[model samples]
Target: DVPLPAGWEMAKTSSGQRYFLNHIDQTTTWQDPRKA
Candidate 1:
């Protein structure tokens, strides 16, 4: 499973790419599926 920081939410792109989003700042961090 992927590890996200506190208060972060998991999101996905149209291409099915995984990412982490912070609602407070509206920031998005893309995740590399090839890694853990």
Candidate 2:
């Protein structure tokens, strides 16, 4: 259970690395946005 902020977006890092891209804030962070 999280915010997401719960407001972020999800995407791939590269080949196989899953990650998160910030939405409405303008940023990029790998690993689930806050914590997987």
Candidate 3:
């Protein structure tokens, strides 16, 4: 089985933060489907 690395919390973007998965630190973008 694969384990998540350290500091890899299920982080989500801010209620209004906008970003894309192609950009750096874009994990937040995937956290919410509404923004996608």
Candidate 4:
């Protein structure tokens, strides 16, 4: 997962489906260390 300025993080799912909730309006919506 490419978190832009923060760089990428390792994200693995059982289905390997890409998922992200980063939108221009949601630049800093949710900040969770556990999720990122």
For residue 5, model 3's alpha carbon misses the true position, in angstroms, by 29
Q: Which residue pairs clash in candidate 3?
A: none
The per-prediction tally of clashing pairs is 0, 1, 0, 0
Residue-level lDDT tens digits of model 2 in 1-36: 566456677675568877666676777676664465
Off by over 4 Å in 1: 1-4, 12-14, 31-36
Model 2 residue 13 CA deviation (Å) reads: 5.4
Of candidates 4 and 2, the better by TM-score = 2
lDDT of 4 by residue, 1-36 (tens): 433434323244478543434443444323443466
Tens-place lDDT per residue, model 3, 1-36, is: 134333334444588544445234435444434333
Off by over 4 Å in 4: 1-6, 18-36
Q: How far out, in Å, is residue 13 in model 3? A: 5.2
What TM-score would every model get versus the actual structure?
0.46, 0.46, 0.20, 0.21
Report RMSD (Å) for each prediction in the order shown.
4.2, 3.2, 7.1, 9.9
lDDT of 1 by residue, 1-36 (tens): 345466567676688777877767887767543453
Candidate 3 ranges with C-alpha deviation above 4 Å = 1-14, 23-36
